[PDB]
Amino acid sequence: GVEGFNCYFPLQSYGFQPTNGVGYQ
């Protein structure tokens, strides 16, 4: 019933994904 399988959520990586905007640390 849960979209996908028993594994770490997708968004979990979206927060660590490589960004192209370095500013305001």
Side-chain angles (χ1 to χ4, degrees), residues 9-23:
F9 292 88
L11 273 144
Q12 226 237 46
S13 251
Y14 207 103
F16 223 91
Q17 268 205 337
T19 11
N20 314 329
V22 185

Side-chain angles (χ1 to χ4, degrees), residues 1 3 5 8 16-18 21 23:
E3 56 193 19
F5 269 80
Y8 65 98
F16 223 91
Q17 268 205 337

